Amino acid sequence: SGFRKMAFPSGKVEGCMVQVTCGTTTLNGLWLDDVVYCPRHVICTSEDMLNPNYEDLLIRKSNHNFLVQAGNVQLRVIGHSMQNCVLKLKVDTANPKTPKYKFVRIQPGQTFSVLACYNGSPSGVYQCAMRPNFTIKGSFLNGSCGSVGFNIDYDCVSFCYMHHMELPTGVHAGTDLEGNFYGPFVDRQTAQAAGTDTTITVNVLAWLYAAVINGDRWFLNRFTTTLNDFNLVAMKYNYEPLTQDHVDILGPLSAQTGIAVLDMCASLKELLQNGMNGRTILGSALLEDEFTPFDVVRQCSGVTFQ
Amino acid sequence: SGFRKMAFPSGKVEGCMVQVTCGTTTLNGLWLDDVVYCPRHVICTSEDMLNPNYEDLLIRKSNHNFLVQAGNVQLRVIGHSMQNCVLKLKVDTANPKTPKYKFVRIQPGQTFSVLACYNGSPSGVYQCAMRPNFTIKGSFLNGSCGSVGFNIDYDCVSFCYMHHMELPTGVHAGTDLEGNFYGPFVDRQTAQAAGTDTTITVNVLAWLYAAVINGDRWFLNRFTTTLNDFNLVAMKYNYEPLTQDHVDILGPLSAQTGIAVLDMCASLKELLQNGMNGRTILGSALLEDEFTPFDVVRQCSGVTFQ
């Protein structure tokens, strides 16, 4: 029992983190086989970052302008190219610690682990969700760009996020590992802003099931609701719609607890309309939406990775 | 910016996790140099665990009764001994992945990272605090005993916790790495129970400072309080007393924010007496007490580890 914001073990990613320096700009890179991936804004300067012409900036660089440090060992750069908003630095050494990996792009509502890094050195690990508005509520300081987000499935690391920037509300934006931004953000200094968010309804329901599995049942009730009637309430509280596919994905948790999905929707409806009245659920006084149905099954059943 | 429950990178500990089997009982062990450490209740059987005589049980075992698996490689046991509530299995191979390490015992109120493991394979990582009542609110399923808790300081892993059991309220008890239980718990099946807990006042204050550093200021006020007058309120809300040493430890955060410690105590007092009135602090609707002043400085300043 218990229920925690649980990240994947980070060892496989730690062995891929390096430091990339261009000029006086230093950030994190990801070393897989003989390529180092990093944000292209490593080639910018204080005045460049207003409205940079990255193609122009890059043609003016040479391999020797990029210093890559893997621990206390320097990696000779032998080639460079731009792919969307990431740089690909070809180095003369394949990373012997390269795990089996994939570059995957995730959906809003999906979760991943972040290995926050500074100067190529891992600092901490935590779990994040991709918000509906394509930001993430991370924890990042200056010099963290290039830190990556990932999931692990058995032995394979699916990289899904590379950190680039902080938005004015303190949330974070970045790209997939092909360099394509999540959401309507650009790697330059504009007035860009996050844009309105919603609550991830299917995840809230998954977390209520986690709570029942763990013995919190006070919010259960005898009522039920229809899917359409629930979605009317969801819209009014800024929750996103629940679909039949969400209902289906919640099937296993429904079957394990014996609480019909639409019955749990009725419970969520009451919680939205009445608040929590001084009580908590799994140690939270808020409805938590950064656990997917998979996260709940993983933690309340116990899947490992090797 | 941002503020997350952030664990240490787990790679250095992942390389130490092994599977220990005795009879039909399988759990996790920690392999450092040529010793595997694991809970002594690996030698128990369904009927043994009522009131086991562990000295009796152990004299009846041989080295060959212990199978240690490090991944898909079997470690030959060449010696065994009991140290309090842990077993020390001498193996014929020193772990080449042994980090620099220490065995430290922590104080209630202190935090650490847990690498949850099953069958010697890491499953997830999360941050925990030692409660005042010497339990931890972990996330553990059957087969997790032997998973360890730790902190990392530069390159050195300070192991502080080995998981043994779940108490009836769903919280967790275990030992330090010398086998000495945290709190009044025993590795047998009795009616033992957690006992009354309190809230870690100095940590709540640290987290309020984290919030101010991150731009949540709505709970600030012009009032101040004396240390004695604050502690009268703390006692009434089941918070533990604040000492002058706590005030001193909060000095740096006080100086960074310009909010006197006793001024933040006045804010905490109002929050305890009035609740939060529908607002949140760092994404929580509860006063959070599992971040130490060190955790706040680490995350709001950015210290790495190598």
Ligand SMILES: *[C@@H](*)C(=O)N(c1ccc(C(C)(C)C)cc1)c1cncc(Cl)c1
């Ligand atoms: C990601 C990153 O490193 N970065 C950044 C680049 C350059 C500098 C100067 C040293 C030239 C001031 C600082 C930070 C960055 C962060 N967020 C957005 C953008 Cl466009 C770049």
Ligand SMILES: *[C@@H](*)C(=O)N(c1ccc(C(C)(C)C)cc1)c1cncc(Cl)c1
């Ligand atoms: C830690 C652990 O493995 N364990 C446990 C031992 C033995 C068994 C049987 C297979 C013999 C039923 C199950 C679990 C354990 C957990 N919590 C408390 C105690 Cl005393 C032992």
